[PDB]
Amino acid sequence: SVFSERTEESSAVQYFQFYGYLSQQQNMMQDYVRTGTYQRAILQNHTDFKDKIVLDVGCGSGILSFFAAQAGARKIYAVEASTMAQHAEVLVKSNNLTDRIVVIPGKVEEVSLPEQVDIIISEPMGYMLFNERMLESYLHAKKYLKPSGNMFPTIGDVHLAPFTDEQLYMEQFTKANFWYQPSFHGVDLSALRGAAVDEYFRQPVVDTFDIRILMAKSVKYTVNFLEAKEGDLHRIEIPFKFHMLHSGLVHGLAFWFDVAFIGSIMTVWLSTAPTEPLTHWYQVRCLFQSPLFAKAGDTLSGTCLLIANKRQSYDISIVAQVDQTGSKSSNLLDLKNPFFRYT
Amino acid sequence: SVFSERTEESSAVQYFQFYGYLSQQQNMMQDYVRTGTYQRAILQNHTDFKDKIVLDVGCGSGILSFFAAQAGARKIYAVEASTMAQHAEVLVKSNNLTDRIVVIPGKVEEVSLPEQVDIIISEPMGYMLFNERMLESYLHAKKYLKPSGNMFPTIGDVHLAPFTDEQLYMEQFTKANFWYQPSFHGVDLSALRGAAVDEYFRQPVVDTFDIRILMAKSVKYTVNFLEAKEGDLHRIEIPFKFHMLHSGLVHGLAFWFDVAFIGSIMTVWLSTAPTEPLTHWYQVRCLFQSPLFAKAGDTLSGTCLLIANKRQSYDISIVAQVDQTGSKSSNLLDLKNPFFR
Amino acid sequence: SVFSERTEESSAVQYFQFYGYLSQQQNMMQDYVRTGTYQRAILQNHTDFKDKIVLDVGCGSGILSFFAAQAGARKIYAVEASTMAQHAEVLVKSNNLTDRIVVIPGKVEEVSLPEQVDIIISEPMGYMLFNERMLESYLHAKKYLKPSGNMFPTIGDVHLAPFTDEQLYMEQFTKANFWYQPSFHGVDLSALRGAAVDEYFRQPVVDTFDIRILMAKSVKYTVNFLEAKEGDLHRIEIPFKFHMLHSGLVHGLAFWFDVAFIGSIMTVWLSTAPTEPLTHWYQVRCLFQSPLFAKAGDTLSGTCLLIANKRQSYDISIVAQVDQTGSKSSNLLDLKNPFFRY
Amino acid sequence: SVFSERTEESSAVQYFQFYGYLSQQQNMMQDYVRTGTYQRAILQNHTDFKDKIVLDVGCGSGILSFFAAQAGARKIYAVEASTMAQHAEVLVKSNNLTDRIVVIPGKVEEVSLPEQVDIIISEPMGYMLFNERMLESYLHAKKYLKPSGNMFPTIGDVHLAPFTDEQLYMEQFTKANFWYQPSFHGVDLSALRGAAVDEYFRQPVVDTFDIRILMAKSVKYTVNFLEAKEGDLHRIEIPFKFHMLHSGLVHGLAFWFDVAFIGSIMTVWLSTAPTEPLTHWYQVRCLFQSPLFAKAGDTLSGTCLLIANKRQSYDISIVAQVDQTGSKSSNLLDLKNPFFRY
Ligand SMILES: COC(=O)c1cc(O)c2cc(NC(=O)NCCCCNC(=N)NC[C@H]3O[C@@H](n4cnc5c(N)ncnc54)[C@H](O)[C@@H]3O)ccc2c1
Ligand SMILES: COC(=O)c1cc(O)c2cc(NC(=O)NCCCCNC(=N)NC[C@H]3O[C@@H](n4cnc5c(N)ncnc54)[C@H](O)[C@@H]3O)ccc2c1
Ligand SMILES: COC(=O)c1cc(O)c2cc(NC(=O)NCCCCNC(=N)NC[C@H]3O[C@@H](n4cnc5c(N)ncnc54)[C@H](O)[C@@H]3O)ccc2c1
Ligand SMILES: COC(=O)c1cc(O)c2cc(NC(=O)NCCCCNC(=N)NC[C@H]3O[C@@H](n4cnc5c(N)ncnc54)[C@H](O)[C@@H]3O)ccc2c1
């Protein structure tokens, strides 16, 4: 019941319906960097799986469990709450692994596992790492992890960097200005211009971009999944101090993430950086309401505060100022209403 | 309420959140054929509004009410269940129409209107006309219509026609065939190929197409909103008999719709046909899992059956056979998971 | 006889009937690259024929014997099992070479030659080099070759490369899909979908293609006809490891071949590569039933295994996997039912 | 058996291998005029099948049996000699007709049926109706037909007509003239020109043509399958007297056929005429060695003689003369080596 107490029923319904589609599973599977890196992380750390007990949190089609099986896992508990659980069972039988993979339909916060596991595996990451709040389910499942146990992924580093994108900033007002007309089919729309601007600026922009728009080395916030607690992700305060590498108008912050699989043999990384090939996580950009001018050598400092909501998302609050000028800007954004951009 | 008894709370939440965004209101407004045709229908039938009482069902930003006001409506009750009701009120004040347009926040099945109206106006059409099930709310609102009152739109014609599009058919099978692989990173996926094909073929394809793909004259199913009852739309049985004009593989049925605004002065049509400019309704195609071969001269007969569900959509059953050969295809589709091409 | 023990009578009948037609000999002679390269190989190595004894295995119309004669061969035994041996005799008379070219009707495994030869010549190559299994007759005929004799051709290189061709893959699955129909004139065909797909994908595709579809440098398997024995061609195991140069779906393997005529004066090559002008051998592609995704830098390894059958062809088994993912495709192929796509 | 005594094993092997492929079955099935007319003939004559015993000779995939089942047949014995019999069995199970369709693997001349049948159905027609000689198997199967029994098809009409096609005639010599060259890579080929011409002229041309090339109303030779005996098709003598409608050079005879399904309710026709849509039987044209000039009003008379051979085909002998001139021509053709021109 930890899941249903932090999540509106209306949101859980839609969430699980979405991951219940094969088309969606196929998308995730066809991302070769994602699928291949998970496989590489598990198989190259075979000693972390050989004759071990394994929990796969939100197994979907089962693919990560099959990898754990390839690596030599004695026993794998594959938990999945969507109707995809049925399809995972089918694959476990057709691949003759009924003696090693047990699919358990339900939420990991609600099901009973019969024993403690040596290692947990999952793909719980959303946009800017935290969105969809499955990282809480992943951490929750540590109640089943032996003390010496491991987690794959082991850590997550959400990166934050300032960007310049005059054209993105301008789009907002250009769109909002639809309403700034005194006779649209004889109707004066202009009283709504302000509300339109607000709405557009509350949407985090999900797409990719040229790394040339980044104005400073990114700042890293690390969650270590071995030590973290579920509750650590209810309120996430990310302080930042950027040392500006380029002079210009900073229109917002860009977000991406890495996770690392820290095994006994080696550490394997999965990156969603804009310097790396595009994943189904893209990148995320949050605009400031007002651009901040900064010179190369200036510091831009502030806080990104993420406050978990009952729609399995975050309210994002960003405050920033150029320390050498005192010019400051903010923005409050809702990751439950992202703008998926094609410009 | 009738609305909450026919609708899961989870679906209503999302539905009304979607229409609550200004960005979404702007997209509907910027469809010039939609906005312009509604305006033309109302203003050219000014006598249907001059000094009349009006109900606007699901008014959104209020745009249709403003049109009713331009046409000379004494009084317009604008009902809207999303938070857009707040923004509509703002526009009514800034346009100095507080004496003529009264916004009433809530569902039309739940609110109290103080009087009966002469005419109802709404844009309740979804994909394939019926999707989103607002046509029920529109019909429900007739409890407020005087005897001899009018409705704008007045009727809706659904059009059904068989199409050939080998490339469309192949896309879906090409996607589905992912699940045939016997060793995807060493994993045999092929036990799910059937489930994958079923799911993909249950998705109605929302996009446009050249009219050259149509293999017979369309068949028309008319709902007359003046006479129809809310419950008529719970189960909709559309029989069809196409006379094939071209020989080839029929890969599915294509759907579009017209509505007509039948006023005292003139009848104005809003069409979503593929012969007409593209609207935000596009057209919808339902693929058969297996094509049917037909020769020109052959008849293709069957039934399209639409059964309303609690997610404000329809489960669609399409059964079709080429009479001269007995070649038959049955197909089940869910308009709650459309494929946008 | 070695021939009739490795070949069903039904297959030999048809094989020899096919090469017995003048129309078929004209088609082979009109391939100028084939005819011209054979001529160039023989004439430019004239010292390999001047005053030498020659065996032409499966001479057909006789054309290669005439070339050996132009080069100065003392004596040429031209063996041919089809009825074309009589048309070859006619040409030997009309060209006043009765003193130098002796046609011997019959199979080279069955006839008696009166002496040993200095050199053997033949065109025994089929699709993918080996099809029709005449390479065995060519190797069998070495019982007539002196120690230190030569073979023309001398070696054969089979080239294997991975290819991407989505449109090819689609045409065959579109054909196969006929058998998914639940109501073809009211009859449910779909229980045979699996079998139809198998059948279609077992057909090697004989045509040409742009070299741009190739996703890695080809791999070479060499048969040296001087050293090889007839029995070596009963089971042919071709290992391969491709280093992928491009990322994408690998829909199969493409095959072609070169033979080299290694004479005393020079080596002349006859290539059927897609970089070279088209011959009557074209190229051959074997499709995988399921494509393999590979990234550039990945290795694609496996085996092409050819097992000779009694219908003068091979049962081909192709096993390939992307080493970095363990994605694997196994495919069977029957060279006796090729799909001609040109 | 009657089949193996009239057929060389080499030929039977290949024949049955060819019809054993699903790809080939699919081709036959996708010809809508063939498949649809068979269906229409059986269902419109439902009273010929309701609660009746049925034999389907060479059922292939089974499609005609399924039609007999749709029409209400109590029991259908579906005989098929190719490995397609296996696939037909699979379809009978997947269509829940194991109680009504019994697939019997083997040749209809060799298998045991447990009872006599009311009606036989088959698609035994080849090029010019008779080619491949399955019409003999169809007639052979009458040993299983009750006295009142019927046959579908019931009759076959072969149509013969004189044609003009200067360009077709010319092609032959243009091809043959490959050999009429004194130095093809230094070899004199010309001694073979005669033999090449002969070979080309012995090939019946399988393709279609504009009906405007026909110079007289066609002449009809009818086989009634109810009365005919297997041996009647060993030697088929077709006399003809054409009354010329157009003046010009007659370069040969064009052949096509109709079969009729004569039921109790109605007669349904399947035509392969050039006036009708193209089928997988096309039409067949046999050239004269020398064109015959005829004026409109002249009569062109002669005989077409078909003599069955052991390669499941016919040797065709055509003799024709213009009666008013005494200008005569001849031609011996072999339908076992047809030229596909389409
Ligand atoms: C109007 O649209 C929007 O505005 C909108 C907004 C958005 O944010 C959007 C985000 C999108 N997502 C997206 O791109 N993802 C990337 C894919 C990788 C993540 N894969 C993953 N996390 N798999 C988890 C598996 O774990 C299961 N699971 C979870 N919790 C569990 C629990 N407690 N117990 C048991 N099993 C559990 C779950 O069922 C599933 O199988 C896509 C569309 C969007 C549209
Ligand atoms: C992943 O993507 C999917 O899965 C998906 C699936 C889909 O099906 C999608 C469908 C889409 N539809 C769409 O673009 N339509 C445009 C047609 C024009 C507007 N049509 C209409 N009816 N206006 C309603 C107005 O009337 C109000 N209203 C309704 N009911 C009321 C009641 N009872 N009382 C009072 N007011 C009420 C309502 O709030 C609003 O103002 C778009 C996206 C999709 C995505
Ligand atoms: C749908 O169609 C199919 O299914 C199919 C299947 C296929 O595989 C096909 C293959 C095709 N091949 C083809 O175009 N090749 C041309 C390349 C030239 C190779 N030259 C060659 N082989 N000539 C040997 C000569 O040497 C004689 N000879 C052989 N053995 C002998 C022996 N032991 N003793 C004495 N004489 C012997 C022989 O008679 C002949 O004169 C064409 C069509 C196809 C269609
Ligand atoms: C070397 O290339 C050439 O030069 C060549 C020369 C040619 O002449 C060619 C002719 C071609 N033919 C062709 O296009 N036909 C189209 C019409 C098909 C008619 N349908 C049919 N005949 N069905 C027979 C069914 O009846 C079964 N069956 C027969 N006898 C049986 C028996 N005794 N017992 C039991 N079952 C028996 C049989 O297995 C099958 O299922 C094609 C290629 C050619 C190439």
Side-chain angles (χ1 to χ4, degrees), chain A residues 126-139:
Chain A
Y127 302 151
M128 36 195 288
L129 181 51
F130 301 116
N131 194 45
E132 307 178 43
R133 297 185 63 180
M134 200 197 164
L135 275 174
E136 288 167 66
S137 299
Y138 185 49
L139 291 180

Side-chain angles (χ1 to χ4, degrees), chain D residues 18-72:
Chain D
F18 174 81
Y19 286 107
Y21 288 112
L22 290 164
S23 63
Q24 174 52 35
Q25 289 295 318
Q26 177 178 356
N27 281 349
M28 295 185 284
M29 282 182 241
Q30 285 176 329
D31 182 338
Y32 176 84
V33 307
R34 170 266 190 190
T35 303
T37 303
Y38 264 94
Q39 195 183 24
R40 224 176 322 105
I42 290 160
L43 295 191
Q44 284 164 343
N45 292 294
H46 54 263
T47 60
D48 291 300
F49 289 92
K50 204 176 184 198
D51 217 55
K52 301 276 205 239
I53 306 121
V54 180
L55 168 57
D56 180 353
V57 185
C59 72
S61 70
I63 187 75
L64 300 185
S65 289
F66 290 121
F67 294 163
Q70 291 166 12

Side-chain angles (χ1 to χ4, degrees), chain C residues 22-23 26 95 185 199-200, chain D residues 22-23 26 39 188 199-200:
Chain C
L22 291 162
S23 63
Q26 161 182 346
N95 287 257
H185 298 263
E199 184 184 296
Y200 278 112
Chain D
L22 290 164
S23 63
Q26 177 178 356
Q39 195 183 24
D188 183 351
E199 181 178 300
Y200 284 124

Side-chain angles (χ1 to χ4, degrees), chain D residues 239-252:
Chain D
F240 60 81
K241 184 164 284 288
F242 298 120
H243 306 95
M244 298 310 284
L245 293 172
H246 298 103
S247 308
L249 300 182
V250 172
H251 293 91

